[PDB]
PDB file of all heavy atoms in Angstrom:
ATOM      1  N   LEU A   1      79.501 168.217  40.521  1.00 52.41           N
ATOM      2  CA  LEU A   1      78.328 168.078  39.663  1.00 52.41           C
ATOM      3  C   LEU A   1      78.709 168.150  38.189  1.00 52.41           C
ATOM      4  O   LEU A   1      78.221 167.357  37.374  1.00 52.41           O
ATOM      5  CB  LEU A   1      77.317 169.170  39.995  1.00 52.41           C
ATOM      6  CG  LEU A   1      75.818 168.892  39.922  1.00 52.41           C
ATOM      7  CD1 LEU A   1      75.092 170.110  39.360  1.00 52.41           C
ATOM      8  CD2 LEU A   1      75.504 167.641  39.113  1.00 52.41           C
ATOM      9  N   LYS A   2      79.576 169.100  37.830  1.00 54.64           N
ATOM     10  CA  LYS A   2      80.031 169.226  36.447  1.00 54.64           C
ATOM     11  C   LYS A   2      80.660 167.927  35.956  1.00 54.64           C
ATOM     12  O   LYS A   2      80.341 167.438  34.863  1.00 54.64           O
ATOM     13  CB  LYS A   2      81.024 170.385  36.338  1.00 54.64           C
ATOM     14  CG  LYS A   2      81.643 170.586  34.968  1.00 54.64           C
ATOM     15  CD  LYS A   2      82.826 171.545  35.049  1.00 54.64           C
ATOM     16  CE  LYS A   2      83.458 171.790  33.688  1.00 54.64           C
ATOM     17  NZ  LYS A   2      82.576 172.603  32.807  1.00 54.64           N
ATOM     18  N   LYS A   3      81.549 167.344  36.764  1.00 55.62           N
ATOM     19  CA  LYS A   3      82.183 166.084  36.395  1.00 55.62           C
ATOM     20  C   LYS A   3      81.153 164.964  36.278  1.00 55.62           C
ATOM     21  O   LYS A   3      81.156 164.201  35.303  1.00 55.62           O
ATOM     22  CB  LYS A   3      83.259 165.733  37.423  1.00 55.62           C
ATOM     23  CG  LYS A   3      84.065 164.481  37.098  1.00 55.62           C
ATOM     24  CD  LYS A   3      85.048 164.154  38.215  1.00 55.62           C
ATOM     25  CE  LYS A   3      86.046 163.084  37.793  1.00 55.62           C
ATOM     26  NZ  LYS A   3      87.109 162.872  38.820  1.00 55.62           N
ATOM     27  N   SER A   4      80.252 164.859  37.261  1.00 58.73           N
ATOM     28  CA  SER A   4      79.278 163.770  37.273  1.00 58.73           C
ATOM     29  C   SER A   4      78.349 163.839  36.067  1.00 58.73           C
ATOM     30  O   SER A   4      77.991 162.806  35.488  1.00 58.73           O
ATOM     31  CB  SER A   4      78.471 163.806  38.570  1.00 58.73           C
ATOM     32  OG  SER A   4      77.592 162.691  38.670  1.00 58.73           O
ATOM     33  N   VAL A   5      77.942 165.048  35.680  1.00 58.52           N
ATOM     34  CA  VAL A   5      77.049 165.202  34.539  1.00 58.52           C
ATOM     35  C   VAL A   5      77.754 164.807  33.248  1.00 58.52           C
ATOM     36  O   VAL A   5      77.165 164.156  32.377  1.00 58.52           O
ATOM     37  CB  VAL A   5      76.514 166.644  34.486  1.00 58.52           C
ATOM     38  CG1 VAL A   5      75.903 166.945  33.128  1.00 58.52           C
ATOM     39  CG2 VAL A   5      75.497 166.858  35.592  1.00 58.52           C
ATOM     40  N   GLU A   6      79.026 165.185  33.108  1.00 58.11           N
ATOM     41  CA  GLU A   6      79.777 164.818  31.912  1.00 58.11           C
ATOM     42  C   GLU A   6      79.916 163.305  31.799  1.00 58.11           C
ATOM     43  O   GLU A   6      79.640 162.724  30.741  1.00 58.11           O
ATOM     44  CB  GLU A   6      81.150 165.485  31.932  1.00 58.11           C
ATOM     45  CG  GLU A   6      81.980 165.207  30.693  1.00 58.11           C
ATOM     46  CD  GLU A   6      83.459 165.460  30.912  1.00 58.11           C
ATOM     47  OE1 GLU A   6      83.822 165.979  31.990  1.00 58.11           O
ATOM     48  OE2 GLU A   6      84.257 165.131  30.008  1.00 58.11           O
ATOM     49  N   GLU A   7      80.346 162.651  32.882  1.00 55.70           N
ATOM     50  CA  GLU A   7      80.415 161.194  32.896  1.00 55.70           C
ATOM     51  C   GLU A   7      79.076 160.578  32.511  1.00 55.70           C
ATOM     52  O   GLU A   7      79.000 159.731  31.612  1.00 55.70           O
ATOM     53  CB  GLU A   7      80.837 160.699  34.275  1.00 55.70           C
ATOM     54  CG  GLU A   7      82.214 161.121  34.707  1.00 55.70           C
ATOM     55  CD  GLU A   7      82.578 160.534  36.054  1.00 55.70           C
ATOM     56  OE1 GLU A   7      81.764 159.750  36.599  1.00 55.70           O
ATOM     57  OE2 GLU A   7      83.674 160.857  36.565  1.00 55.70           O
ATOM     58  N   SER A   8      78.004 161.003  33.187  1.00 54.90           N
ATOM     59  CA  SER A   8      76.683 160.444  32.932  1.00 54.90           C
ATOM     60  C   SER A   8      76.243 160.675  31.492  1.00 54.90           C
ATOM     61  O   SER A   8      75.504 159.860  30.931  1.00 54.90           O
ATOM     62  CB  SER A   8      75.677 161.050  33.909  1.00 54.90           C
ATOM     63  OG  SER A   8      74.481 160.294  33.966  1.00 54.90           O
ATOM     64  N   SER A   9      76.695 161.771  30.877  1.00 53.74           N
ATOM     65  CA  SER A   9      76.349 162.037  29.485  1.00 53.74           C
ATOM     66  C   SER A   9      77.119 161.121  28.541  1.00 53.74           C
ATOM     67  O   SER A   9      76.546 160.581  27.588  1.00 53.74           O
ATOM     68  CB  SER A   9      76.621 163.501  29.153  1.00 53.74           C
ATOM     69  OG  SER A   9      76.168 163.826  27.852  1.00 53.74           O
ATOM     70  N   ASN A  10      78.420 160.937  28.791  1.00 52.47           N
ATOM     71  CA  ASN A  10      79.211 160.021  27.974  1.00 52.47           C
ATOM     72  C   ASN A  10      78.659 158.603  28.032  1.00 52.47           C
ATOM     73  O   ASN A  10      78.710 157.876  27.033  1.00 52.47           O
ATOM     74  CB  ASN A  10      80.671 160.039  28.423  1.00 52.47           C
ATOM     75  CG  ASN A  10      81.296 161.420  28.315  1.00 52.47           C
ATOM     76  OD1 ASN A  10      80.832 162.263  27.546  1.00 52.47           O
ATOM     77  ND2 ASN A  10      82.358 161.653  29.081  1.00 52.47           N
ATOM     78  N   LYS A  11      78.123 158.198  29.183  1.00 55.48           N
ATOM     79  CA  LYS A  11      77.522 156.875  29.289  1.00 55.48           C
ATOM     80  C   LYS A  11      76.204 156.794  28.527  1.00 55.48           C
ATOM     81  O   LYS A  11      75.834 155.715  28.052  1.00 55.48           O
ATOM     82  CB  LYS A  11      77.331 156.512  30.762  1.00 55.48           C
ATOM     83  CG  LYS A  11      78.645 156.472  31.532  1.00 55.48           C
ATOM     84  CD  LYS A  11      78.429 156.315  33.024  1.00 55.48           C
ATOM     85  CE  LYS A  11      79.719 156.598  33.782  1.00 55.48           C
ATOM     86  NZ  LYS A  11      79.582 156.358  35.247  1.00 55.48           N
ATOM     87  N   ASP A  12      75.488 157.913  28.396  1.00 56.88           N
ATOM     88  CA  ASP A  12      74.293 157.926  27.558  1.00 56.88           C
ATOM     89  C   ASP A  12      74.641 157.569  26.120  1.00 56.88           C
ATOM     90  O   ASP A  12      73.981 156.726  25.497  1.00 56.88           O
ATOM     91  CB  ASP A  12      73.615 159.295  27.617  1.00 56.88           C
ATOM     92  CG  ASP A  12      72.925 159.548  28.937  1.00 56.88           C
ATOM     93  OD1 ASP A  12      72.575 158.564  29.620  1.00 56.88           O
ATOM     94  OD2 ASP A  12      72.726 160.731  29.289  1.00 56.88           O
ATOM     95  N   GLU A  13      75.689 158.197  25.578  1.00 57.69           N
ATOM     96  CA  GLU A  13      76.118 157.885  24.220  1.00 57.69           C
ATOM     97  C   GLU A  13      76.580 156.441  24.107  1.00 57.69           C
ATOM     98  O   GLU A  13      76.271 155.761  23.119  1.00 57.69           O
ATOM     99  CB  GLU A  13      77.224 158.847  23.786  1.00 57.69           C
ATOM    100  CG  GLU A  13      76.699 160.182  23.275  1.00 57.69           C
ATOM    101  CD  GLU A  13      77.629 161.341  23.583  1.00 57.69           C
ATOM    102  OE1 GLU A  13      78.860 161.169  23.473  1.00 57.69           O
ATOM    103  OE2 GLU A  13      77.123 162.426  23.945  1.00 57.69           O
ATOM    104  N   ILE A  14      77.316 155.946  25.106  1.00 59.31           N
ATOM    105  CA  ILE A  14      77.758 154.555  25.088  1.00 59.31           C
ATOM    106  C   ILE A  14      76.553 153.615  25.021  1.00 59.31           C
ATOM    107  O   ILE A  14      76.503 152.705  24.190  1.00 59.31           O
ATOM    108  CB  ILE A  14      78.642 154.247  26.307  1.00 59.31           C
ATOM    109  CG1 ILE A  14      80.017 154.902  26.154  1.00 59.31           C
ATOM    110  CG2 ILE A  14      78.784 152.746  26.489  1.00 59.31           C
ATOM    111  CD1 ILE A  14      80.997 154.508  27.238  1.00 59.31           C
ATOM    112  N   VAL A  15      75.573 153.839  25.898  1.00 61.47           N
ATOM    113  CA  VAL A  15      74.382 152.989  25.917  1.00 61.47           C
ATOM    114  C   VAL A  15      73.660 153.058  24.582  1.00 61.47           C
ATOM    115  O   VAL A  15      73.208 152.033  24.049  1.00 61.47           O
ATOM    116  CB  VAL A  15      73.460 153.394  27.081  1.00 61.47           C
ATOM    117  CG1 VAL A  15      72.108 152.714  26.946  1.00 61.47           C
ATOM    118  CG2 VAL A  15      74.105 153.043  28.408  1.00 61.47           C
ATOM    119  N   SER A  16      73.528 154.260  24.022  1.00 64.75           N
ATOM    120  CA  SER A  16      72.876 154.399  22.726  1.00 64.75           C
ATOM    121  C   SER A  16      73.625 153.617  21.653  1.00 64.75           C
ATOM    122  O   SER A  16      73.020 152.875  20.870  1.00 64.75           O
ATOM    123  CB  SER A  16      72.771 155.874  22.353  1.00 64.75           C
ATOM    124  OG  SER A  16      72.332 156.016  21.017  1.00 64.75           O
ATOM    125  N   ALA A  17      74.953 153.758  21.617  1.00 64.59           N
ATOM    126  CA  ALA A  17      75.753 153.031  20.637  1.00 64.59           C
ATOM    127  C   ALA A  17      75.601 151.523  20.798  1.00 64.59           C
ATOM    128  O   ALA A  17      75.438 150.801  19.808  1.00 64.59           O
ATOM    129  CB  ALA A  17      77.219 153.432  20.761  1.00 64.59           C
ATOM    130  N   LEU A  18      75.657 151.030  22.040  1.00 63.61           N
ATOM    131  CA  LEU A  18      75.539 149.591  22.262  1.00 63.61           C
ATOM    132  C   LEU A  18      74.172 149.079  21.832  1.00 63.61           C
ATOM    133  O   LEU A  18      74.056 147.971  21.293  1.00 63.61           O
ATOM    134  CB  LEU A  18      75.806 149.256  23.730  1.00 63.61           C
ATOM    135  CG  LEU A  18      77.285 149.240  24.120  1.00 63.61           C
ATOM    136  CD1 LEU A  18      77.463 149.106  25.625  1.00 63.61           C
ATOM    137  CD2 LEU A  18      78.015 148.120  23.403  1.00 63.61           C
ATOM    138  N   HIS A  19      73.122 149.874  22.049  1.00 63.50           N
ATOM    139  CA  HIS A  19      71.790 149.447  21.643  1.00 63.50           C
ATOM    140  C   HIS A  19      71.710 149.298  20.132  1.00 63.50           C
ATOM    141  O   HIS A  19      71.165 148.312  19.622  1.00 63.50           O
ATOM    142  CB  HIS A  19      70.739 150.430  22.156  1.00 63.50           C
ATOM    143  CG  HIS A  19      70.296 150.155  23.560  1.00 63.50           C
ATOM    144  ND1 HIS A  19      70.043 151.155  24.472  1.00 63.50           N
ATOM    145  CD2 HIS A  19      70.071 148.987  24.207  1.00 63.50           C
ATOM    146  CE1 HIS A  19      69.675 150.617  25.623  1.00 63.50           C
ATOM    147  NE2 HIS A  19      69.686 149.304  25.489  1.00 63.50           N
ATOM    148  N   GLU A  20      72.269 150.264  19.399  1.00 64.12           N
ATOM    149  CA  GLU A  20      72.353 150.153  17.946  1.00 64.12           C
ATOM    150  C   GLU A  20      73.081 148.878  17.537  1.00 64.12           C
ATOM    151  O   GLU A  20      72.609 148.123  16.680  1.00 64.12           O
ATOM    152  CB  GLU A  20      73.062 151.383  17.375  1.00 64.12           C
ATOM    153  CG  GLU A  20      73.133 151.427  15.860  1.00 64.12           C
ATOM    154  CD  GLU A  20      71.881 152.005  15.233  1.00 64.12           C
ATOM    155  OE1 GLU A  20      71.010 152.499  15.982  1.00 64.12           O
ATOM    156  OE2 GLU A  20      71.772 151.967  13.990  1.00 64.12           O
ATOM    157  N   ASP A  21      74.233 148.615  18.160  1.00 63.01           N
ATOM    158  CA  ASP A  21      75.020 147.437  17.809  1.00 63.01           C
ATOM    159  C   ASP A  21      74.218 146.154  17.998  1.00 63.01           C
ATOM    160  O   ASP A  21      74.321 145.228  17.186  1.00 63.01           O
ATOM    161  CB  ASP A  21      76.313 147.421  18.632  1.00 63.01           C
ATOM    162  CG  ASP A  21      76.980 146.051  18.678  1.00 63.01           C
ATOM    163  OD1 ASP A  21      76.532 145.180  19.464  1.00 63.01           O
ATOM    164  OD2 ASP A  21      77.963 145.846  17.932  1.00 63.01           O
ATOM    165  N   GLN A  22      73.400 146.082  19.049  1.00 61.35           N
ATOM    166  CA  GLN A  22      72.681 144.835  19.280  1.00 61.35           C
ATOM    167  C   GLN A  22      71.478 144.697  18.361  1.00 61.35           C
ATOM    168  O   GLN A  22      71.064 143.573  18.069  1.00 61.35           O
ATOM    169  CB  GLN A  22      72.261 144.717  20.744  1.00 61.35           C
ATOM    170  CG  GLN A  22      70.904 145.281  21.075  1.00 61.35           C
ATOM    171  CD  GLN A  22      70.558 145.069  22.533  1.00 61.35           C
ATOM    172  OE1 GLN A  22      71.228 144.310  23.236  1.00 61.35           O
ATOM    173  NE2 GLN A  22      69.518 145.748  23.000  1.00 61.35           N
ATOM    174  N   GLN A  23      70.914 145.813  17.887  1.00 63.10           N
ATOM    175  CA  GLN A  23      69.908 145.733  16.833  1.00 63.10           C
ATOM    176  C   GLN A  23      70.507 145.140  15.565  1.00 63.10           C
ATOM    177  O   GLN A  23      69.899 144.278  14.920  1.00 63.10           O
ATOM    178  CB  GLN A  23      69.325 147.114  16.541  1.00 63.10           C
ATOM    179  CG  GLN A  23      68.832 147.868  17.752  1.00 63.10           C
ATOM    180  CD  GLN A  23      67.336 148.068  17.752  1.00 63.10           C
ATOM    181  OE1 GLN A  23      66.568 147.110  17.657  1.00 63.10           O
ATOM    182  NE2 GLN A  23      66.910 149.322  17.856  1.00 63.10           N
ATOM    183  N   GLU A  24      71.704 145.597  15.193  1.00 64.56           N
ATOM    184  CA  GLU A  24      72.382 145.052  14.022  1.00 64.56           C
ATOM    185  C   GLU A  24      72.670 143.571  14.201  1.00 64.56           C
ATOM    186  O   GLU A  24      72.427 142.762  13.297  1.00 64.56           O
ATOM    187  CB  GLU A  24      73.679 145.817  13.758  1.00 64.56           C
ATOM    188  CG  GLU A  24      74.661 145.058  12.872  1.00 64.56           C
ATOM    189  CD  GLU A  24      74.157 144.878  11.450  1.00 64.56           C
ATOM    190  OE1 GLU A  24      73.328 145.698  11.002  1.00 64.56           O
ATOM    191  OE2 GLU A  24      74.587 143.915  10.780  1.00 64.56           O
ATOM    192  N   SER A  25      73.206 143.196  15.362  1.00 65.68           N
ATOM    193  CA  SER A  25      73.481 141.790  15.633  1.00 65.68           C
ATOM    194  C   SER A  25      72.224 140.948  15.498  1.00 65.68           C
ATOM    195  O   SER A  25      72.282 139.813  15.016  1.00 65.68           O
ATOM    196  CB  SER A  25      74.071 141.630  17.033  1.00 65.68           C
ATOM    197  OG  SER A  25      75.401 142.082  17.073  1.00 65.68           O
ATOM    198  N   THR A  26      71.080 141.482  15.934  1.00 63.25           N
ATOM    199  CA  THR A  26      69.830 140.733  15.856  1.00 63.25           C
ATOM    200  C   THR A  26      69.458 140.443  14.407  1.00 63.25           C
ATOM    201  O   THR A  26      69.042 139.325  14.072  1.00 63.25           O
ATOM    202  CB  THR A  26      68.701 141.497  16.550  1.00 63.25           C
ATOM    203  OG1 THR A  26      69.030 141.717  17.924  1.00 63.25           O
ATOM    204  CG2 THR A  26      67.409 140.705  16.471  1.00 63.25           C
ATOM    205  N   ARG A  27      69.597 141.443  13.531  1.00 64.91           N
ATOM    206  CA  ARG A  27      69.311 141.222  12.118  1.00 64.91           C
ATOM    207  C   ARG A  27      70.272 140.200  11.525  1.00 64.91           C
ATOM    208  O   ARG A  27      69.849 139.250  10.854  1.00 64.91           O
ATOM    209  CB  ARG A  27      69.385 142.539  11.349  1.00 64.91           C
ATOM    210  CG  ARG A  27      68.371 143.588  11.775  1.00 64.91           C
ATOM    211  CD  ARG A  27      68.490 144.839  10.909  1.00 64.91           C
ATOM    212  NE  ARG A  27      68.090 146.052  11.621  1.00 64.91           N
ATOM    213  CZ  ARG A  27      68.944 146.956  12.092  1.00 64.91           C
ATOM    214  NH1 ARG A  27      70.248 146.789  11.921  1.00 64.91           N
ATOM    215  NH2 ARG A  27      68.494 148.029  12.731  1.00 64.91           N
ATOM    216  N   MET A  28      71.575 140.371  11.773  1.00 67.50           N
ATOM    217  CA  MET A  28      72.546 139.464  11.172  1.00 67.50           C
ATOM    218  C   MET A  28      72.374 138.044  11.686  1.00 67.50           C
ATOM    219  O   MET A  28      72.576 137.083  10.934  1.00 67.50           O
ATOM    220  CB  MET A  28      73.966 139.958  11.427  1.00 67.50           C
ATOM    221  CG  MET A  28      75.012 139.228  10.607  1.00 67.50           C
ATOM    222  SD  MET A  28      74.823 139.526   8.835  1.00 67.50           S
ATOM    223  CE  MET A  28      75.916 138.268   8.167  1.00 67.50           C
ATOM    224  N   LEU A  29      71.988 137.886  12.953  1.00 66.44           N
ATOM    225  CA  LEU A  29      71.706 136.549  13.464  1.00 66.44           C
ATOM    226  C   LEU A  29      70.503 135.928  12.759  1.00 66.44           C
ATOM    227  O   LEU A  29      70.530 134.742  12.404  1.00 66.44           O
ATOM    228  CB  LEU A  29      71.484 136.601  14.974  1.00 66.44           C
ATOM    229  CG  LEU A  29      72.788 136.720  15.760  1.00 66.44           C
ATOM    230  CD1 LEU A  29      72.516 137.037  17.202  1.00 66.44           C
ATOM    231  CD2 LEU A  29      73.591 135.443  15.638  1.00 66.44           C
ATOM    232  N   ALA A  30      69.447 136.714  12.536  1.00 67.14           N
ATOM    233  CA  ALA A  30      68.276 136.204  11.830  1.00 67.14           C
ATOM    234  C   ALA A  30      68.640 135.764  10.419  1.00 67.14           C
ATOM    235  O   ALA A  30      68.339 134.634  10.014  1.00 67.14           O
ATOM    236  CB  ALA A  30      67.179 137.268  11.797  1.00 67.14           C
ATOM    237  N   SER A  31      69.310 136.641   9.662  1.00 65.03           N
ATOM    238  CA  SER A  31      69.745 136.293   8.312  1.00 65.03           C
ATOM    239  C   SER A  31      70.614 135.039   8.308  1.00 65.03           C
ATOM    240  O   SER A  31      70.453 134.169   7.443  1.00 65.03           O
ATOM    241  CB  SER A  31      70.494 137.469   7.691  1.00 65.03           C
ATOM    242  OG  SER A  31      71.028 137.122   6.426  1.00 65.03           O
TER     243      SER A  31
END
C-alpha cells in the first residue's frame, strides 16, 4: 500500500504538470 500510494501520488503531479503544459500550448497555438 505504501508503494502504491507513492506511485499514485507521483502520477498526480505528472498529470497536473501535463495539464498545465497543454493549457500553455493552447494559448501559443491561438496566438
